């Protein structure tokens, strides 16, 4: 995944559970690039313990070998509807109890799955990262509670990757604007596009008055990637997306432009991006990008991608 | 509305209806910055006619005189407020089919509204202020449809203000990330704390169980406030506050040394506003601000803001 002018850009994919990383691996997958944890929390009648959690993180580290994994702390909400949980009812529920948030108020959450990656990554390259951040106190706290849980398992003798690498999911507006003081603390940014733009274009998808409104590739959105990109970067750091839009050919060139160092999607999607970047300028790309993100409409900006990709 | 250093700094009162004009004006009202028109709308079992709100805002107007007035277009939304819209049931509604678009996709209420708010321009200066805008089509479309009634209310022979000028409530992140672009279009910024606090920490006011996440006062919305003033300015324009922040005497000083050049309130605030704008030196507030927005939480900010004091 290197392009012609020599640019590398790690192509990963997205899995839900073990057996998805067969398919991943089947496919040249380059690793992992966002492990959906929900699995483990959704249809029990209590929360996955954290032996069955380690033994499923240990699980996926040992199936991927050389490659890392980037586990997905819980990110669920009030949607998914969990009965054991007792949830709220919420006026709107794509913007309140969810995510980080509950972890971080229901601390048996947040000890049990991070002592289980902790002591997975053992057995594996392991990254943690964490969704809905929207602060950098959320970052700090979560920081000492991660190694009051890497101290309490030194304690007791188990061995975990000292080094492990902790990264935030820039998928709210609030993180994107206060992107480099966020990269000054964690090691990895991972956008997850779908919920940056809905929350950027207050959009909610599955409103069908309004999903004609849903437009990743709008100035606004792609230009609030492109200073998370440049944050990470001023850093010494790397950003990666997840969402959707990375599995998406119409962006690949767009996004390789723009300085984008991961790629993670469907593992089924992932040749066709190789492809493209094997066969891309990188420096070229990146004029496009800078050329493409100072247009004021949609529009435009796409005019000009599809000329580029005209060639 | 001057500082001891000779920044001037429009300062003016929001108000629901004609009678809410009178207690501005005791409270050194310098003017209306915005004009909720959700009054006519509300409590009614059809459109208010181009005709009622052309007297609401001939009453308004008149009732300033030589002041400006900034009448916000409507800004309906809700579970369900009005049968008579015909809502639909939505699982966000504070993210789905809200006002600026409800407008949009039931074209009658354009018509209606920016024929009265033209008509009306001729007794006043009246400027017009969009909310919840998130995109530059959105706006270039509705420019077209300014100047379709313009030029359609002209052969039909009422006059109204040619020099009528234009702006945007920016409530949204995209508004605020695209802020130069649409300074391109506009005239002038209004900013709706109310919402794009909530639009950018992603966090629902009337949600109990994260209310204490709601923070105005935090380095992301406030840094993308910054972003729309000095987009505002570097296309020699201006913005303003029309959020409830305007009205706190705990984030006036900052605001002034943002740069921002107009604040908008309930008028009771006006006063103490009034006071610190003309006893702080609007330089020495940009050196504050410089050094406050840089700052990683919100509780150093708020250390930095509360340290000038």
Redesign the interface.
């Known amino acids: 995944a290197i392009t012609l002018d020599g640019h590398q850009v790690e192509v990963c994919a997205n899995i839900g559970t073990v057996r998805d990383v067969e398919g991943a691996e089947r496919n040249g997958a380059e690793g992992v690039g966002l492990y959906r944890t929900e699995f483990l929390f959704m249809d029990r009648d209590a929360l996955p313990t954290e032996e069955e959690q380690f033994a499923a993180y240990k699980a996926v580290a040992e199936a991927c070998g050389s490659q890392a994994v980037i586990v997905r702390t819980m990110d669920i909400g009030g ?1 998914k509807e969990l009965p054991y949980m007792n949830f ?1 009812k ?8 969810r995510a980080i ?1 509950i972890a971080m ?1 229901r601390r048996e959450i947040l000890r049990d799955q991070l002592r289980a990656i902790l002591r997975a990554s053992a057995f594996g390259k392991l990254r943690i990262m964490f969704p ?1 951040i ?4 959320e970052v ?1 706290a979560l920081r000492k509670e991660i190694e009051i849980y890497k101290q309490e398992l030194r304690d007791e003798g188990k061995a975990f990757d000292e080094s492990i690498e902790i990264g935030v999911m820039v998928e ?4 994107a ?2 992107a480099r ?1 966020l990269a ?1 603390e964690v090691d990895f940014f991972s956008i997850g596009t779908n919920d940056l733009t ?7 998808r ?2 069908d ?2 999903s004609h ?1 849903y437009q990743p590739m ?4 792609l ?2 990637i492109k200073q998370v990109i440049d944050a990470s970067h001023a850093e010494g750091k790397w950003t990666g997306m997840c969402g959707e839009l990375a599995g998406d050919e119409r962006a690949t060139l767009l996004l390789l432009g723009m300085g984008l160092d991961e790629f993670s999607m469907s593992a089924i999607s992932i040749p066709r991006i190789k492809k493209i970047i094997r066969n891309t300028n990188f420096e070229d790309a990146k004029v496009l990008a800078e050329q493409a993100l100072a247009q ?4 435009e900006l796409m005019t000009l991608v599809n000329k580029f990709i005209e060639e």
Request: aromatic residues 6%.
């Open positions: 949607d709220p919420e006026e709107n529920p794509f913007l309140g109890w948030r108020d809905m929207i602060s950098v106190e700090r709210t507006p609030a993180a604007t206060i003081h000054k809905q929350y950027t274009l207050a959009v909610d599955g409103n008055m309004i409104l709008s100035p606004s959105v230009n609030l004021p409409t949609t529009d």
